[PDB]
Scaffold this active site. Structure first.
Site, PDB file in Angstrom:
ATOM      1  N   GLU A   1     -14.166  -6.213   3.658  1.00 14.79           N
ATOM      2  CA  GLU A   1     -13.554  -6.119   4.967  1.00 14.79           C
ATOM      3  C   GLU A   1     -14.473  -6.480   6.126  1.00 14.79           C
ATOM      4  O   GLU A   1     -15.552  -5.891   6.288  1.00 14.79           O
ATOM      5  CB  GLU A   1     -12.985  -4.714   5.169  1.00 14.79           C
ATOM      6  CG  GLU A   1     -12.174  -4.546   6.451  1.00 14.79           C
ATOM      7  CD  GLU A   1     -11.395  -3.246   6.488  1.00 14.79           C
ATOM      8  OE1 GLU A   1     -10.555  -3.039   5.588  1.00 14.79           O
ATOM      9  OE2 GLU A   1     -11.621  -2.435   7.414  1.00 14.79           O
TER      10      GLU A   1
ATOM     11  N   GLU B   1       0.761  -1.239   0.000  1.00 16.66           N
ATOM     12  CA  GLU B   1       0.000   0.000   0.000  1.00 16.66           C
ATOM     13  C   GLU B   1       0.794   1.294   0.000  1.00 16.66           C
ATOM     14  O   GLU B   1       1.805   1.418   0.699  1.00 16.66           O
ATOM     15  CB  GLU B   1      -0.924   0.002   1.209  1.00 16.66           C
ATOM     16  CG  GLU B   1      -2.001   1.049   1.185  1.00 16.66           C
ATOM     17  CD  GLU B   1      -2.873   0.948   2.393  1.00 16.66           C
ATOM     18  OE1 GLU B   1      -2.438   1.386   3.481  1.00 16.66           O
ATOM     19  OE2 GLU B   1      -3.986   0.402   2.251  1.00 16.66           O
TER      20      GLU B   1
ATOM     21  N   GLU C   1      -5.207  -7.726   7.043  1.00 15.01           N
ATOM     22  CA  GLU C   1      -4.826  -6.323   6.910  1.00 15.01           C
ATOM     23  C   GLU C   1      -4.506  -5.590   8.197  1.00 15.01           C
ATOM     24  O   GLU C   1      -5.192  -5.769   9.194  1.00 15.01           O
ATOM     25  CB  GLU C   1      -5.934  -5.515   6.228  1.00 15.01           C
ATOM     26  CG  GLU C   1      -6.910  -6.294   5.396  1.00 15.01           C
ATOM     27  CD  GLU C   1      -8.106  -5.448   5.016  1.00 15.01           C
ATOM     28  OE1 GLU C   1      -7.960  -4.556   4.157  1.00 15.01           O
ATOM     29  OE2 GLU C   1      -9.195  -5.657   5.591  1.00 15.01           O
ATOM     30  N   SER C   2      -3.477  -4.741   8.136  1.00 19.67           N
ATOM     31  CA  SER C   2      -3.070  -3.881   9.249  1.00 19.67           C
ATOM     32  C   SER C   2      -2.255  -4.479  10.397  1.00 19.67           C
ATOM     33  O   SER C   2      -2.484  -5.610  10.834  1.00 19.67           O
ATOM     34  CB  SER C   2      -4.312  -3.201   9.829  1.00 19.67           C
ATOM     35  OG  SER C   2      -5.132  -2.715   8.785  1.00 19.67           O
TER      36      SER C   2
ATOM     37  N   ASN D   1      -9.591  -7.158   9.041  1.00 24.98           N
ATOM     38  CA  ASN D   1      -8.861  -6.012   9.594  1.00 24.98           C
ATOM     39  C   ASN D   1      -8.474  -6.196  11.060  1.00 24.98           C
ATOM     40  O   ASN D   1      -9.351  -6.292  11.933  1.00 24.98           O
ATOM     41  CB  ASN D   1      -9.702  -4.727   9.452  1.00 24.98           C
ATOM     42  CG  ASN D   1      -8.856  -3.449   9.492  1.00 24.98           C
ATOM     43  OD1 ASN D   1      -7.737  -3.440   9.999  1.00 24.98           O
ATOM     44  ND2 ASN D   1      -9.404  -2.360   8.970  1.00 24.98           N
TER      45      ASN D   1
ATOM     46  N   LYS E   1      -8.222   2.149  -2.034  1.00 22.76           N
ATOM     47  CA  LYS E   1      -8.459   2.008  -0.615  1.00 22.76           C
ATOM     48  C   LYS E   1      -9.140   3.264  -0.097  1.00 22.76           C
ATOM     49  O   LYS E   1      -8.494   4.278   0.185  1.00 22.76           O
ATOM     50  CB  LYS E   1      -7.136   1.785   0.111  1.00 22.76           C
ATOM     51  CG  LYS E   1      -7.279   0.985   1.378  1.00 22.76           C
ATOM     52  CD  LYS E   1      -7.794  -0.406   1.063  1.00 22.76           C
ATOM     53  CE  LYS E   1      -8.086  -1.146   2.342  1.00 22.76           C
ATOM     54  NZ  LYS E   1      -6.866  -1.220   3.189  1.00 22.76           N
TER      55      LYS E   1
ATOM     56  N   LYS F   1       0.627   4.824   1.131  1.00 21.91           N
ATOM     57  CA  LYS F   1      -0.085   5.633   2.093  1.00 21.91           C
ATOM     58  C   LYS F   1       0.896   6.692   2.578  1.00 21.91           C
ATOM     59  O   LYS F   1       2.092   6.412   2.726  1.00 21.91           O
ATOM     60  CB  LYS F   1      -0.532   4.740   3.248  1.00 21.91           C
ATOM     61  CG  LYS F   1      -1.562   5.340   4.175  1.00 21.91           C
ATOM     62  CD  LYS F   1      -1.425   4.790   5.598  1.00 21.91           C
ATOM     63  CE  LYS F   1      -1.522   3.272   5.669  1.00 21.91           C
ATOM     64  NZ  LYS F   1      -1.531   2.830   7.092  1.00 21.91           N
TER      65      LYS F   1
HETATM   66  O1  137 Z   1      -4.329   3.069   9.453  1.00 24.29           O
HETATM   67  C1  137 Z   1      -5.155   3.714  10.097  1.00 24.29           C
HETATM   68  O2  137 Z   1      -4.745   4.384  11.040  1.00 24.29           O
HETATM   69  C2  137 Z   1      -6.622   3.716   9.781  1.00 24.29           C
HETATM   70  C3  137 Z   1      -7.489   4.514  10.607  1.00 24.29           C
HETATM   71  C4  137 Z   1      -8.893   4.566  10.370  1.00 24.29           C
HETATM   72  C5  137 Z   1      -9.483   3.814   9.296  1.00 24.29           C
HETATM   73  C6  137 Z   1      -8.674   3.012   8.457  1.00 24.29           C
HETATM   74  C7  137 Z   1      -7.240   2.959   8.694  1.00 24.29           C
HETATM   75  N1  137 Z   1      -6.444   2.161   7.860  1.00 24.29           N
HETATM   76  C8  137 Z   1      -6.734   2.044   6.463  1.00 24.29           C
HETATM   77  C9  137 Z   1      -6.212   0.720   5.957  1.00 24.29           C
HETATM   78  O3  137 Z   1      -6.533   0.681   4.609  1.00 24.29           O
HETATM   79  C10 137 Z   1      -4.719   0.443   6.313  1.00 24.29           C
HETATM   80  O4  137 Z   1      -3.969   1.413   5.626  1.00 24.29           O
HETATM   81  C11 137 Z   1      -4.175  -0.920   5.795  1.00 24.29           C
HETATM   82  O5  137 Z   1      -4.975  -1.964   6.352  1.00 24.29           O
HETATM   83  C12 137 Z   1      -2.675  -1.125   6.161  1.00 24.29           C
HETATM   84  O6  137 Z   1      -2.236  -0.822   7.326  1.00 24.29           O
HETATM   85  P1  137 Z   1      -0.838  -0.917   7.874  1.00 24.29           P
HETATM   86  O7  137 Z   1      -0.081  -2.057   7.296  1.00 24.29           O
HETATM   87  O8  137 Z   1      -0.228   0.311   7.402  1.00 24.29           O
HETATM   88  O9  137 Z   1      -0.932  -1.012   9.366  1.00 24.29           O
END
Ligand code: 137
Length: 259
Positions: free
Chosen positions: A163, A53, A214-215, A184, A114, A55
């Site tokens: 999601e 991603e 994800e995340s 998520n 996204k 970002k």
């Molecule tokens: O990342 C955040 O802080 C956030 C906050 C509120 C709502 C959605 C959010 N994330 C959006 C989401 O698309 C994340 O960018 C991805 O799941 C990847 O996350 P990462 O690998 O950067 O932790």
């Protein structure tokens, strides 16, 4: 106060209008050809699939990539990604719909928009910018809304990453016959992280359902252990937080640089 995702949707509605007034569907509609890339296919296989991603910032970490450049990022993400995600939300992640095309040209993998999609306009809007697929959230929608939006994306030859954040949502994505379920690990209310959610919600998902975790994926060890539960990962910050972006992919995705 209130859930963070709550505030987000409020602003997403107020955002589409300020743009639906500007760039209405009619001013480009029947001019957006279907997606000439297959998201769904790109994530198939016994090999761990990666969704890298682009970002720049987020509610949870503020500004991440002090020096953003969707050009150089795709220039790297292209040697490894199965798909490439792009935040097209400006107010919260400093994303932009124009980044989509910027990448779709520098990178051959199917591009994923996204964003917090609550309006068919948005889907039509991203397809216009080369968005090969979109993200629909069961925590922001309900079956009817999802079917509606689901049908729309499946009209433009666009993939749909569904999601889920809990068991109820998981069960829903199942009932809806969703093909690609993104679980998520982040609680979009208080922005807390729990990778067990992936462990918890993936076992039931059955085949013909590609599970994307994800995340929160920060290390390779986490990639490796969680690869036992999900088909792939969507990683943002673990990569965007580093200048040498290639060295970052080697450490986190390949468990290279010998750590
Ligand atoms: O990342 C955040 O802080 C956030 C906050 C509120 C709502 C959605 C959010 N994330 C959006 C989401 O698309 C994340 O960018 C991805 O799941 C990847 O996350 P990462 O690998 O950067 O932790």
């Amino acid at each position: 106060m209130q859930c963070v995702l709550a505030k987000i949707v409020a602003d997403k509605a107020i955002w589409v209008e300020a743009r639906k007034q500007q760039q209405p569907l009619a001013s480009f509609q029947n001019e957006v050809q279907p997606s000439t890339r297959h998201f769904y296919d790109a994530l198939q296989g016994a090999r761990t699939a990666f969704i890298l991603e682009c970002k720049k910032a987020s509610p949870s970490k503020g500004v991440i990539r002090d020096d953003f450049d969707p050009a150089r990022i795709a220039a790297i993400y292209k040697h490894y990604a199965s798909a490439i995600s792009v935040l097209t939300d400006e107010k919260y992640f400093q994303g932009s719909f124009n980044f989509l095309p910027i990448v779709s040209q520098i990178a051959p993998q199917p591009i994923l928009c996204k964003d917090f999609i609550i309006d068919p306009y948005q889907i039509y809007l991203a397809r216009y910018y080369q968005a090969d697929a979109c993200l629909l959230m069961l925590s922001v929608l309900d079956d009817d809304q999802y079917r509606q939006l689901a049908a729309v994306a499946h009209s433009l030859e666009m993939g749909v990453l569904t999601e889920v954040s809990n068991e109820e949502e998981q069960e829903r994505a199942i009932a809806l016959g969703a093909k690609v379920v993104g679980i998520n690990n982040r609680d979009l209310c208080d922005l807390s992280i729990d990778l067990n959610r992936t462990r918890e919600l993936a076992p039931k998902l059955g085949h013909n359902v590609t599970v994307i975790s994800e995340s929160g994926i920060n290390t390779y060890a986490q990639v490796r252990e969680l690869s036992h539960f999900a088909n792939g990962f969507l990683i943002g910050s673990a990569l965007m937080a580093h200048d040498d972006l290639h060295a970052a992919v080697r450490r986190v995705l390949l468990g290279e640089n010998k750590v």
